[PDB]
Amino acid sequence: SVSSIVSRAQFDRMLLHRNDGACQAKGFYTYDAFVAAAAAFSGFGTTGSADVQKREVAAFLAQTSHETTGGWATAPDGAFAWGYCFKQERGASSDYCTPSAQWPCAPGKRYYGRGPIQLSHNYNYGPAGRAIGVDLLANPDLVATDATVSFKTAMWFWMTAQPPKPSSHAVIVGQWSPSGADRAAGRVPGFGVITNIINGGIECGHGQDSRVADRIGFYKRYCDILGVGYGNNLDCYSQRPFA
Template sequence: MHKHLLFFLAFSCSFAMPSIAQKSCVMRFLNEQKWNELFPNRYGVSTYKDPKRAAAPAIDFYSFQAFCKAAKQFPNFLNEGKEADRKRELAAFLANAAQETSGGWDEAPGGYFKWGFYFLEEQDWSKTHNNYADTSKKNWLPANGVSYHGRGPKQLSWNYNYGQFSEAYFGDKDSLLRHPELLATDPVVSFASAIWFWMTAQPPKPSCHDIMIQKWIPTTRDSAANRYPGFGTTVNVINGGVECGLANPKKKTQNRYAYYLYFCKYFKVDPGKNADCNGQKPFNF
């Protein structure tokens, strides 16, 4: 217990005394004005009357400040590789998060791309996946009476992901296994869950961070499956079993690619090679 408390206190101190590198990681490319321009319809800000939401959110949940506070706790995020690599990493992170949380449609006011970070939780989650509880994962057994459906920028789901993130963030697995709703009530924890997933390799999958900064070296098996550094492989890590290796990509996958190109253009960087996963085999095959 004492060890976990020390871990949490040390972790929390990053808010009070960020290093120079930590302070500049996001601010190098973004500020609050740009954030508001990119995400004018985010959860807690949009004035759109949506029947899917029972009440208007009380706070600007996906605020720029919350993103920055979470990013400070991951000093290598947007802070490795060449300048172009860092811009592509930011574009890739935002593209995946914006698509995961998008409330946009083709004729949406302002255009589809202006509706990223619209949803906080997975829509209609109760109809599928038995609360996303996998009892075969003995190290992170689900608690009774809670659901591990998608929440936050990454829409983190499944008990084993909540448990692993809880261990990394709080120093114990039970904080989020017992209270997964924290990802929908604490903006900084919510953003941190997305960045943690982005930065963490789960073999045989590399981390999305290492993919985008070209630190990841594909194995012979990866090469045979046509998996190489580029945005497409981050999609494979996140949702490859559903979205990759398809002759006719799904609409949401096409939107994910389009988001990436949109953000690359915004940050004035070439999208690089392997920007889709159409020809890739998923990691779990």
């Protein structure tokens, strides 16, 4: 049902310039691929009222747009029209291998960021590949070469709790309730705690941050396009990182 809520026209209006300029992933991120991936993750964009469903797709596309953004302050149509410009991390310093019995690194393979959520590390490629049905420890580049696997890895990340963190899905559909430690930390439901889930260690809890604002910039633009309210608690400037 996610295609009922977001049309191809809408999708393209939000992801306006992905196939433009000097973007590195032109033609790669397709509506059809997005919609097929969404189907594998039951509940995504189909949980709650029509308004909750829109917020979820907006929030999803907004977090992933930041991770892949080719935007700048004076970019054509604004900085928030240039998400999904990249599919691979540019100039990683390492293979992102952190030695693991559970998720062992494959020799000569690298787990730098790929796809919509710029998935990183063996200990994320491992689980994600298990969920999707395919070996991403041995072939992590699949995340950069198959448009449907790419989206599937981002939605796996969206739909999956990694304690003490809840899933981004649970938060945006209003299913998450903060613990006592969460409330001590100032973590309250909303878009801002999803930013905390994604990259809170660097971005959250220390006042106004340009990266956090960029995520919110995409979110508001997409919410506007889908015609839905933003909901509360958009930033994480006053939230301690998870731990």
